[PDB]
């Protein structure tokens, strides 16, 4: 439900229609009364540009800052302040634990609507210290997550996530984990680890009840595509494609239904065509997907690697037909991947044979050692000079 704010937000951010999307996007904060944080929030959100606020123009004309955003903010705050005062004062005269708790949960929920990140931590802690039902406690954290994602800075969410982790364990409520799982996936798509995002999204689809979600239908369409990124074909074929779970989840996938088919058939040509389309329809729409580069690389590796891994020979003409990509282009993309050598294949253009070495030997395991090894090499030395002085 507050999750709807995010869905809308990806559209003015990406190019797929800038102006029209902005009014709608602006309305959900307009009611909540987001004003203090709003100007700072726009700057962070950008990683494919275009501000969701009126404080900057990037690609097209921005929607204006409504007066309503300011008016609802002042009214909601004044109310919250009056209510809380009687309760805080009453709390002292009466049972300390009960009265303050009820007051604090409400006070926190309004602070989160403004989007005050600091106001959300302070409000939360007092309730925890005092007596409070385990289900009720755990629910509270969901709001703090929603603001970090809203802000869509990687740093801020990492801080929230640490707190969320300590807290979930104490309470022990599984219904509450499901809502938590979605937020966790939403951050994952946002960085370079879709691999992680896939797991979270799949588990949640099978058993969910409609609380803290932006639209079930969009969410199911999205979930299948992410599973592909993480999962190579022997896992992908069983779980998603032929599995029982996908029917139970319900179908709204078709662009993606065809996509999975192309890897299984061993006919790659249609995979590449769909890849290009998937970036335009899903990714842009959604707020979460930065460092798009990762997504592309992995998907393209998946197609190449599965054919090559199975076959130490193919003839060039067959290999070219199956891949459905142009000859110069198939070569150039691979050239990056071969260097890493988890694939590790040669291509002849004189013998018309594409060879796969396919190391599952000492070569494979050793190459990774080297890459990790470079990072460790700089750090250790840097540490040694700083301390000496």
């Amino acid at each position: 439900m507050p999750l709807e704010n995010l869905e809308e937000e990806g559209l003015p951010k990406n190019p797929d229609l800038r102006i029209a999307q902005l009014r709608f996007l602006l309305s959900l904060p307009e009611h909540r009364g987001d004003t203090a944080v709003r100007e700072e929030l726009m700057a962070a959100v950008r990683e494919n540009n275009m501000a969701p606020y009126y404080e900057a123009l990037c690609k097209s004309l921005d929607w204006q800052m409504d007066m309503d955003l300011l008016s609802k903010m002042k009214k909601a705050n004044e109310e919250e302040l009056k209510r809380l005062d009687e309760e805080l004062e009453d709390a002292e005269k009466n049972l300390g634990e009960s009265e303050i708790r009820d007051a604090m949960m409400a006070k926190a929920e309004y602070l989160c609507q403004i989007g005050d990140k600091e106001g959300a931590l302070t409000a939360f802690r007092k309730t925890y210290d005092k007596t409070v039902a385990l289900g009720h406690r755990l629910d509270i954290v969901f709001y703090l997550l929603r603001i970090g994602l809203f802000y869509m800075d990687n740093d801020l969410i990492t801080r929230n996530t640490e707190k969320a982790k300590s807290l979930i364990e104490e309470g022990g409520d599984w219904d509450r984990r499901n809502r938590l799982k979605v937020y966790q996936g939403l951050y994952c798509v946002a960085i370079r680890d879709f691999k992680q995002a896939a797991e979270l999204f799949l588990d949640t689809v099978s058993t969910f009840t409609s609380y803290e979600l932006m639209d079930y239908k969009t969410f199911v369409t999205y979930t299948v595509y992410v599973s592909m990124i993480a999962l190579e074909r022997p896992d992908l074929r069983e779980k998603v494609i032929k599995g029982a779970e996908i029917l139970e989840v319900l179908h709204s996938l078709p662009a993606v239904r065809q996509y999975l088919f192309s890897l299984y058939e061993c006919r790659y040509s249609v995979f590449f065509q769909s890849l290009a389309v998937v970036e335009q329809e899903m990714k842009k729409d959604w707020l979460f997907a930065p460092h798009y580069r990762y997504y592309v690389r992995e998907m393209r590796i998946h197609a190449y690697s599965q054919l090559l891994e199975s076959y130490r020979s193919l003839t060039l003409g067959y290999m070219a037909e199956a891949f459905g990509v142009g000859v110069e282009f198939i070569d150039q993309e691979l050239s990056r991947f071969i260097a890493a050598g988890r694939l590790h294949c040669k291509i002849d253009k004189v013998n018309e044979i594409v060879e796969t070495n396919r190391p599952d030997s000492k070569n494979w395991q050793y190459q990774e050692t080297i890459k990790k090894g470079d990072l460790l090499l700089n750090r250790v030395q840097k540490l040694s000079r700083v301390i000496n002085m």
Binding site: F272, A276, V277
Partner: peptide, 24 residues
């Protein structure tokens, strides 16, 4: 080239159409 993903959206579409008409 900062990120391959922008260029790649055009590449996959273009490359398939030409390749298909000719060989595949």
């Amino acid at each position: 080239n900062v990120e391959d993903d922008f260029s790649n959206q055009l590449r996959a579409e273009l490359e398939k159409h030409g390749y298909k008409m000719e060989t595949s």
